[PDB]
DNA sequence: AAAACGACGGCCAGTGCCATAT
DNA sequence: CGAGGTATGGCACTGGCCGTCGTTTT
């Protein structure tokens, strides 16, 4: 209606009618009574608020008799097709392989008796499709074979087949696999393991127009069945803590060992010789037949697979929704244009000139260290003395004169006295010896003189190397640095007179001595490890940021660059060396960890024949330019919790002003006349557990003080649980959201207490500690009541333990069972956290999947030429149309109101708060990005997405400013 | 200060010339200094060389271009500058009563506007070689004009005139694209000042404006006593094509794309001089370790050391050593490696003061052979880097070399 | 003539038709070369470093200024530069006027300078610090390279870039190390020329008695003097240090003795002008040898895909860049003209071979190539090609 | 003249620590 | 009785096994 018994703001009367009716039993007596008492318990009572503008709308029909009904119905009329072609696949009756594998390039059908012929493309419903691709070559697929119901198929690459000097190093649609038929039936269903792979080498994927193709991976069902998590995965393999039940059920994603699992049988051979990784073009053409003959052992392999498992996935996922989630979401797609080489230059370049820098910077030094081998003068060094200062012997077997006309045979008479001595190979060994002049220290870092990339000096140095802090003579607090093989990095603190090539104690207590000058141990930190024998000296531990059970790899790592702007940390050197140092590492850490990845991936350029009309005549539109895409290979289903995986787009980088290259999303370009219009969901894990417990209680919202708070606060007015958090301990929103979502998932106050101590530099241990306890004490109090009972969020912990408890836990909102690797009956207590974080994590995932098909429908619904463009977990993103941008704003929102009123019917609430009703605010933009105002400036790019790209800001909508643009309506014309 | 001990060093290895007292600051930076030594020469040919090859060398668009050292014809009034007439003139023009009462204190316009001056920019005769250059690439709107030379510049007989050696690159761009030019150009001349130095930082840069409004950017280098201008980017726009070419404006314009606009003009001018002394002071380095290695040493970047190999002779027959290290001068001369003959020079010193000596000149490797280069092929050799000695065998030494610097190029 | 047409259509020579003349170019007041001028003058600058002062022990660089100020010999003929900031002090006072303004003629020798006539003088100057770098070891050289100005009779001014080498040895065999050099001089000339008939020499006499050689082209119109050797004993040492001659000393059969000073001039811009007309001796081809050759091959591209062509010429340029050889980038026009009309357009500019790359590369990675001088066309495998165009180069070196 | 008998790099797999995302 | 969770990937280092080739024994 308009206010409930508490006080609470609920959803407006016209769409509450609209969406909920009147059937709903008003809470009794005594359930009001109880969310009464506990509201007065925790002072949250009596505190009116001020209520939100109401919003008026006529949403479409909703079929069915309510919200689960029509949701139930949307599924099925989505997933109705490909489940078809699934069966169709089940009753699948092929006949063996052919006798020999044929050498044409395109694709052969093979029929019965071995007999081959040319066909355009594979003509079924439904296919088990697998590519193998010569590495060495790029990554133009070399060859594939596939397997459809009374038919074999084999394609081969014209690369394959002909012999040319050279190919095109850009790849274009015209070189990829035909895998879709033109404008039976269609909605064609493609099965394989690791089909994103495979989605990648096909033609029609990349074009702007979507398509019905769809994928089902067999690894995503077996994580979704019998899958293991990263422990799980650790401890099976090596199975060659306390309970192993769970194992003969269960195996990892590799295909041998699932075909293994699921139908058993003779085991499948690999390849011995690895020619897709390891041979050239020619080994492949040599070994054709053993090649040909894997891949299709592969390709039925897999598909015995999904015949033993798609059963399994029907009973164990009951729920429409999930197939239908899942197949959407498998259709990830990027767009970008010429800027993104640019960009691989642009980044690359500026890494090359930071690690320029830096390694100059670190070679000179090792250049000057040479020096101390005289005289032996490094035994008094305080950091180089323990390396090899080691010499090797190289190695063998066994006046006035005036001008002259004659001196051209002093000329030959030389060169002839040299062209003998030449020929003195009698005593050089056939291999050369590597600078054995040189001490062995240096030597490792001197890259051999055969090498291909071979460089002067020692130009293998890098700052992760144990040696580069050595010659930097890093110091912690007037202490040097040292290398404990148990222990890790750490720093030697003078004055151990009991013993406690040999150190140079003095060389370390003389510059302590000498650096004090400027300002049984008697120093406090990770304390002293006797076990680390060094006379003279205590080795004490870097702090690390996760306790003192980690051990420092590197001092250089980012969470010590306060320290040194603090000075804590300096260098022997002095200046800004050591600053300057630590700066470039953090710049560059991320590309020198995913430039191999973003470097490499496949794009693929659409020519101008291709591309839509509307850009080509859009005003915007740029000639000459580039118009590519790039199709994310994600695993629909990677994890215990079903969430999508990939290497690179689920872990790419926010842009941001120092860190090189961290522009990448901004690169996810949309043509001209398009846009991408998209949304996030805001505290959305937080509102669930809330939600699951006030359900649990009372059956009421905000019945729980945590869903009372929830729902109070704006994120515009910082008012918000998380900025209300953040602002009680004087943090970042970001560490707010990790130092609660940390305590709901169970981690202990230690964990808390030294996060707060990473962020908040003003406090000490007493003050996080203090505050750690106070605020784990209000949140749930004691767990026991005989000699989770109190607190605000005591009833969530209590409704989440006993739905992970559960013989059979199965999702509240969706149904979806647990794998059957983690069930009581074969784990007992056994990986108890991650089967509590799974309740919530795959209720956000059932969310993920209820906001997809929302999306689709509507789309459907009034024929908006929109597409899904990618989404990470909550994050969504879609390619739109920019006439009809302003449509999809309102289809995002209502999806929004959707999948919050669902969720809520599931858990026998009939209504809904209205402060959760929509979203923050929907993002239009040009590109993506965190926030529409950010320009991401960046070393890569000093000048922005604005004059170096040209692109503009984009605009964050809220509910009345869409409705405003739209009026209510979303009809093409209104 | 510790600057005297590199202009000493500077002194006695014939880097620069003259007394200490002509080798002040001031003469250094103004161009009044009375020259450089050989060294110096040496090291100032191989920074045109590696300037050469970063800015023409691998471009299609880039032409060389030669400026004459003077400005004839008439001339604007009032510049008070220098004016060339040859001493056979300078009684003839007075004799026998040409105008000879007041009038030649108005002579002094006649000296204004009968003479020319000496060259003061590269820039002027860029621009008069503009509408030559146009012809090469077809009117392609983006190319670059690049020279070397010396100009001549007024410094405060009360005042005198200082030369210096200044690269300029002028290119010509759309319009359009001339701030996105300006920035690409301001990065790549930065990073090739950055790569040859020891201490890429000590280079900077800055934004600079003035009364027209124009952007620029400026690059200094961080010498002891402050920063110092190497550099300068100024994006003028058209105005001096117009004014030299006024009028028929038509024929200004190129091809930008499929239009034909008219081009802007990007100015860029280097003082290789300060280059010189900038990269001196670098390599000599105006921590506990460091201050007990106090090696006297100009660590001159290997592509641009004058001196890479020396070459001597060891105790034996004196005759047949003499022969072998005539053989290998020649073959390292002749692939292309500067070698500094010591087997010429009498015996004066020790090995530690033939080596301290290398190091002041900056010389990359010594070379040493002895009676066990006619016993085997091996042959000593020392690496100015580490100061750590080698056997080689000496069929190989003109390959090492050549990868070495080869390599150098790419570290 | 025909050859001075061609060098102002292939941007040898700059400014316009109205300007290029004989004399001009002769005196040095011409406008300047065209790029193609400059790294043909710059080729034979190298060439000329190399056969001197590489290969010898006992010569080495100078630099000399382009000017000299403070006192001078008066009355002569030489540019000098009149006052300059003495232009902003007259105009507010006058000094009476009238035939005292004579003295001011006076005033000019009082603190003008002077330009740079020749490199002679500042390695005269240099002379006496740089003995040192040799111990005092008498014979030894001193070479360089710099432009000279000349009157030319208002009297014009001409820049002509010159090779000078100052020659310091005992005045005993002074006599033999002139005809050496003259020798050796006149061999370089004769190194790169294909008819080294036209290059000769001829003795001189000087009035003081000394004698010396004159180095001379066969120009068309006449012989030109090119370079000059001049055989000039101990009068330019002792002038520039007058009193003490101690410090002029050198050791020589381990005694004492002042040096005898020969002096070698080369027109640097002479010899580029007599290599131009000697190259160019039924087609207008300019045969400039491959040591000279500004400009070493040409590429392009063929009929067929745009992109995959300008590509392989990319790669094809890097590579042929990287190993020291100088590529005009003839593939961004894409054959907009005939051929043949690129071939003559080549061969004007000198470049000795043409290589263009095909659609048929991509196939097999063969590559039509054409020569300069034999002008047969070939197929060859690109990877090769850099290899044997290095060979092309170091055999014409050394036969 | 044949062929043991070793050192000495190449190479790979496995482990540890750090960096990203949500 | 108490744990944050799920994923991805990079480089640095170390242990072991194997193929050359140049001393040593037949
Ligand atoms: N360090 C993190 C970050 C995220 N998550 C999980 C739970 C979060 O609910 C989900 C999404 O987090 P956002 O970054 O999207 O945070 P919210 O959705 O909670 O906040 P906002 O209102 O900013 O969307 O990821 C987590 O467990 N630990
Ligand atoms: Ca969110």
Redesign the pocket.
């Known amino acids: 209606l308009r206010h409930n018994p508490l006080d609470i703001q609920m959803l407006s009367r016209g769409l509450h009618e609209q969406i909920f009716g009147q059937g709903g039993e008003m809470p009794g007596e005594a359930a009001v009574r109880r969310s009464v008492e506990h509201l007065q318990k925790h002072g949250l009572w009596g505190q009116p608020a001020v209520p939100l503008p109401d919003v008026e709308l006529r949403l479409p029909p909703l079929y069915g008799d309510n919200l689960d009904q029509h949701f139930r119905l949307l599924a099925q009329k989505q997933s109705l097709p490909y489940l078809e072609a699934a069966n169709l696949l089940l009753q699948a009756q092929l006949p063996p392989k052919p006798p020999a594998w044929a050498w044409a390039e395109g694709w052969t059908r093979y029929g019965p008796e071995g007999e081959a012929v040319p066909v355009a493309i594979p003509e079924e419903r439904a296919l088990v499709f697998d590519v193998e691709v010569c590495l060495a070559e790029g990554t133009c697929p070399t060859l594939a074979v596939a397997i459809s119901p009374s038919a074999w198929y084999s394609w081969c690459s014209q690369r394959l087949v002909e012999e040319r000097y050279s190919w095109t190093s850009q790849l274009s649609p015209a070189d990829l696999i035909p895998l879709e038929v033109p404008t039976d039936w269609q909605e064609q269903l493609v099965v394989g393991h690791n089909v994103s792979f495979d989605r990648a080498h096909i033609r029609e994927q990349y074009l702007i127009q979507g398509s019905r193709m769809r994928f089902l991976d067999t690894m995503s069902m077996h994580?979704a069945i019998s899958?293991?998590?990263?422990?799980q995965?650790s401890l099976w393999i090596?199975a060659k803590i306390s309970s192993w039940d769970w194992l003969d059920i269960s195996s990892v994603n590799s295909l041998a060992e699932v075909h293994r699992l699921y139908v058993g049988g003779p085991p499948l051979e690999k390849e011995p010789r690895e020619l897709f990784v390891?041979g050239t073009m020619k080994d492949i053409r040599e070994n054709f037949q053993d090649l040909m003959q894997y891949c299709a052992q592969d390709v039925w392999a897999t598909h015995e697979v999904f015949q033993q498992q798609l059963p399994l996935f029907l009973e164990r996922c009951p729920h429409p929704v999930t197939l239908a989630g899942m197949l959407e979401m498998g259709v990830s797609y990027l767009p970008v244009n010429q800027n993104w080489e640019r960009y691989l230059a642009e980044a690359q370049g500026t890494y090359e000139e930071l690690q320029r820098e830096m390694k100059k910077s670190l070679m000179d030094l090792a250049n000057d260290a040479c020096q101390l081998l005289s005289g032996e003068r490094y035994k008094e060094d305080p950091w180089l003395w323990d390396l090899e200062w080691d010499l090797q012997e190289f190695?063998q077997?066994?006046l006035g004169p005036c001008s002259e006309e004659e001196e051209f045979q002093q000329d030959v008479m030389a060169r002839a006295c040299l062209q003998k001595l030449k020929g003195t190979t009698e005593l050089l060994?056939?291999?050369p010896?590597?600078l054995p002049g040189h001490p062995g220290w240096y030597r490792?870092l001197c890259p051999?003189l055969?090498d291909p990339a071979w460089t002067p000096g020692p130009s293998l140095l890098?700052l992760?190397?144990?040696?580069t802090p050595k010659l930097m003579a890093l110091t912690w607090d007037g202490f040097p640095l040292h290398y404990s093989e148990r222990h890790?990095?750490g720093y030697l603190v003078p004055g151990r007179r009991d013993n406690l090539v040999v150190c140079p104690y003095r060389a370390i207590e003389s510059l302590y001595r000498k650096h004090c000058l400027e300002q049984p141990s008697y120093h406090h930190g990770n304390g002293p490890y006797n076990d680390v024998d060094i006379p003279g000296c205590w080795f004490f531990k870097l702090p690390?940021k996760?306790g003192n059970s980690?051990?420092?790899?590197?001092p250089?790592?980012?969470?010590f660059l306060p320290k040194m702007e603090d000075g804590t940390l300096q260098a022997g050197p002095g200046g800004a060396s050591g600053p300057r140092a630590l700066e470039i590492?953090?710049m560059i850490?991320?590309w020198?960890?995913?430039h191999?990845?973003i470097s490499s991936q496949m794009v693929v350029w659409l020519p101008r024949s291709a591309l839509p009309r509307a850009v080509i005549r859009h005003p915007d539109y740029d000639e000459e330019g580039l118009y590519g895409a790039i199709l994310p290979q994600v695993?629909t289903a990677?994890?215990?919790?079903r969430?999508a995986?990939?290497?690179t787009w689920?872990?790419?980088?926010?842009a941001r002003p120092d860190?090189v290259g961290?522009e990448l999303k901004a690169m996810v370009q949309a043509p001209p006349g398009y846009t991408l219009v998209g949304a996030?969901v805001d505290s959305q894990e937080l509102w669930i557990a809330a939600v699951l417990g006030d359900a649990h209680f009372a059956g009421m919202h905000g019945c729980t003080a945590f869903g009372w708070m929830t729902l109070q606060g704006r994120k515009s007015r910082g008012t918000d649980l998380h900025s209300k958090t953040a602002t009680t301990v004087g943090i970042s929103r970001e560490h707010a959201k990790?130092f609660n979502?940390?305590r709901?998932?169970?981690?202990?106050?230690?964990?808390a207490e030294r996060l707060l101590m990473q962020f908040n530099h003003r406090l000490t241990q007493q003050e996080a500690a203090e505050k750690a306890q106070q605020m784990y004490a209000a949140t749930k109090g004691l767990?026991w009541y005989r000699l989770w009972k109190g607190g605000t969020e005591s009833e969530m912990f209590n409704k989440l333990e006993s739905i992970a408890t559960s013989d059979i836990p199965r999702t509240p909102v969706l149904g979806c069972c647990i794998s059957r690797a983690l069930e009581p009956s074969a784990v007992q207590?056994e990986?108890?956290?991650?089967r509590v974080?799974?309740v919530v994590?795959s209720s956000a995932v059932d969310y993920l999947h209820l906001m997809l098909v929302a999306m689709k429908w509507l789309f459907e619904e009034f024929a908006i030429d929109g597409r899904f463009c990618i989404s990470?977990?909550?994050?969504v993103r879609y390619l739109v149309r920019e006439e009809d941008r302003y449509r999809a704003a309102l289809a995002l929102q209502i999806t929004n109101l959707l999948t919050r009123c669902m969720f809520a019917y599931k858990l026998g609430l009939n209504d809904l708060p209205q402060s959760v009703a929509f979203f923050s605010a929907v993002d239009i933009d040009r590109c993506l990005r965190?926030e529409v105002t950010m320009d991401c400036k960046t070393p890569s790019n000093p000048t922005g997405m604005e004059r170096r790209y040209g692109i503009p800001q984009g605009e964050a909508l809220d509910i009345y400013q869409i409705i405003e643009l739209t009026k209510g309506s979303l009809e093409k014309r209104s | 200060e510790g600057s005297e001990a590199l202009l000493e060093i500077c002194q006695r290895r014939h880097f620069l010339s003259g007394s200490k007292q002509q080798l002040s600051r001031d003469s250094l930076l103004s161009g009044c200094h009375p020259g450089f030594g050989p060294l110096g020469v040496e090291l100032r040919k191989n920074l045109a060389a590696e300037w050469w090859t970063s800015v023409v060398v691998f471009r299609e668009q880039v032409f060389p271009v030669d400026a004459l050292h003077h400005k004839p014809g008439p001339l604007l009034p009032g510049d008070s500058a220098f004016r060339l007439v040859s001493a056979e003139t300078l009684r003839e023009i007075l004799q026998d009563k040409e105008l000879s009462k007041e009038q030649l204190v108005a002579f002094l316009e006649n000296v204004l506007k009968t003479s020319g001056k000496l060259r003061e920019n590269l820039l002027h005769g860029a621009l008069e070689h503009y509408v030559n250059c146009l012809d090469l690439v077809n009117k392609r709107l983006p190319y670059g004009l690049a020279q070397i030379g010396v100009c001549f510049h007024p410094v405060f007989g009360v005042k005198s005139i200082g030369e210096k050696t200044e690269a300029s690159l002028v290119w010509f761009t759309p319009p359009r694209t001339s701030n996105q030019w300006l920035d690409f150009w301001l990065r790549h001349r930065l990073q090739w000042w950055r790569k040859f130095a020891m201490s890429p930082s000590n280079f900077s840069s800055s934004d600079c404006q003035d009364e027209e409004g124009r952007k620029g950017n400026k690059l200094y280098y961080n010498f002891p006593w402050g920063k110092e201008l190497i550099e300068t980017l100024w994006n003028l726009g058209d105005h001096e094509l117009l004014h030299m070419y006024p009028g028929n404006v038509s024929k200004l314009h190129g091809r930008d794309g499929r239009k034909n606009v008219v081009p802007c003009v990007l100015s860029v001018n280097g003082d290789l001089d300060r280059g010189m002394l900038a990269y001196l002071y670098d390599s000599f380095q105006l921590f506990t370790r460091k201050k007990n290695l106090h090696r006297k040493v100009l660590k001159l970047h290997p592509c641009l050391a004058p001196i890479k190999v020396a070459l001597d002779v060891g105790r034996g027959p004196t005759l047949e050593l003499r022969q072998v290290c005539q053989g290998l001068f020649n073959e390292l001369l002749e692939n292309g490696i500067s070698v500094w003959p010591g087997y010429l020079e009498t015996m004066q010193s020790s090995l530690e003061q033939l080596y301290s000596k290398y190091d002041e000149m900056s010389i990359l490797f010594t070379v040493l052979v002895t009676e066990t280069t006619l016993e085997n092929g091996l042959i000593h050799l020392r690496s100015r880097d580490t100061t750590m000695k080698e056997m080689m065998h000496i069929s190989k030494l003109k390959d090492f070399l050549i990868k070495y610097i080869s390599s150098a190029k790419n570290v």
């Not at chain 1, 250089?556 to 969470?559: E, G």
């Not at chain 1, 990677?638 to 919790?641: D, K, P």
């Not at chain 1, 990470?872 to 994050?875: G, N, R, Y």
Request: aromatic fraction near 10%.
């Open positions: 994580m899958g293991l998590s990263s422990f995965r090596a390891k190695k077997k066994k060994p056939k291999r010896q590597h490792k051999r055969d890098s992760q190397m144990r040696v890790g990095w690390h996760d980690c051990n420092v790899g590197s250089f790592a980012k969470d590492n953090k850490s991320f020198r960890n995913a191999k990845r695993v990677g994890t215990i919790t969430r995986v990939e290497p689920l872990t790419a980088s926010n860190r961290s996030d990790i979502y940390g709901i998932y169970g981690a202990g106050q230690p964990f767990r207590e990986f108890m956290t991650s974080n799974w994590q990470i977990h909550d994050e965190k």
